[PDB]
């Protein structure tokens with residue numbers, strides 16, 4: 074491990090947490106990242122980390138999950154941090170404030186966070202203009218193996234969920250390499266019920282029709298992001314719909330509304346989605362199930378509790394083509410990205426894999 078990794082983990086990040094509430098810290102992180110005020114990414118991506126999936130080259134398989142850069146303010150800084158791809162959002166059609174504060178809670182003893190942001194968003198128009206300002210810069214980044222995802226949400230007061238997602242496809246689809254239909258936020262009432270079979274098919278048909286209506290060069294992949302709290306029936310229904318409609322991929326998983334036995338944090342009973350270490354294995358197991366139900370034919374982006382190369386490789390071996398992290402960055406700071414990549418490269422070599430591609434779904438072939 075580097076000196077930076079230890080300095081961030083043992084001194085800088087604990088000091089920031091002592092000085093700032095979690096939402097203030099989040100806001101400062103976005104500001105610093107937006108300005109490129111980052112420690113040196115002391116890691117060069119090797120060819121063994123390259124993945125080709127979703128119609129794109131990814132220089133490395135480690136992305137920033139949705140919810141860090143909600144409004145597309147820090148995209149270039151996130152690539153500078155060493156992420157192989159960036160997902161912004163969730164973005165709602167109209168601007169909205171989200172839930173009242175406080176709405177983000179640290180669980181230090183669990184290496185977890187609980188959030189109930191409630192889709193605070195600058196809205197599609199603001200985000201569209203922000204992405205248009207750097208659109209050719211992004212085109213060059215994507216061509217150089219650094220794609221951009223856009224995660225779409227719905228407004229609190231909307232009468233027609235499918236129309237909210239459709240508006241997102243029309244507005245931000247032309248600016249994205251992939252879109253995410255986030256039907257798994259625990260913090261918008263009735264949103265997770267869009268994961269049921271009848272509603273999901275109707276919703277996703279409309280989304281895919283809208284996407285197919287974009288000009289070929291501006292046509293993104295469409296992924297569905299799912300909760301970790303689904304029944305077996307829900308998961309078997311989602312897999313069925315994904316295959317029937319030709320959805321391009323799955324993001325597995327969002328935060329959990331469960332509170333696993335063993336949580337120690339004083340704030341464990343706060344309402345919201347739980348992220349970080351306690352979500353890790355529930356998530357890995359969800360990837361495993363979704364990979365099996367889709368016969369390994371549907372790319373999965375694996376997310377939930379990744380904070381080491383081992384965590385990344387477990388999700389890859391379970392079926393993920395790519396991984397994302399968020400909560401790990403909030404505890405360990407920017408050096409965690411290089412750490413995960415360096416550890417993943419070493420473990421791939423140790424386990425006899427030529428690269429990331431060879432490891433995808435390897436547990437299912439044992």
Ligand SMILES: Cc1cc2nc3c(=O)[nH]c(=O)nc-3n(C[C@H](O)[C@H](O)[C@H](O)COP(=O)(O)O)c2cc1C
Pocket residue numbers: 138139140141143162163177186188190192224255298326327328347348349350352376377378379397398399400401
């Ligand atoms: C503060 C916070 C805000 C989030 N906001 C979003 C969001 O707007 N849209 C979304 O799809 N996921 C959101 N997530 C979920 C993450 O993208 C990710 O699925 C989850 O946190 C699991 O990854 P992790 O354990 O590495 O954090 C958020 C997570 C946190 C902790």
Ligand SMILES: CONC(=O)c1c(C)c(-c2ccc(-c3ccccc3F)cc2)nc2ccc(F)cc12
Pocket residue numbers: 086089090094095096098099100101102103105106110111112177178179180185186188402403404406407
């Ligand atoms: C568990 O306690 N953790 C937080 O309260 C927290 C932190 C410290 C951070 C953070 C701050 C700073 C950098 C950074 C430091 C140097 C250069 C660039 C950076 F982005 C990174 C991340 N971001 C968050 C985002 C969401 C959230 F819910 C909580 C946090």
Ligand SMILES: O=C(O)c1cc(=O)[nH]c(=O)[nH]1
Pocket residue numbers: 140163188189190191192193255257258259260327328346
């Ligand atoms: O905005 C939020 O509250 C939020 C959205 C989401 O999809 N996941 C999450 O944990 N929080």
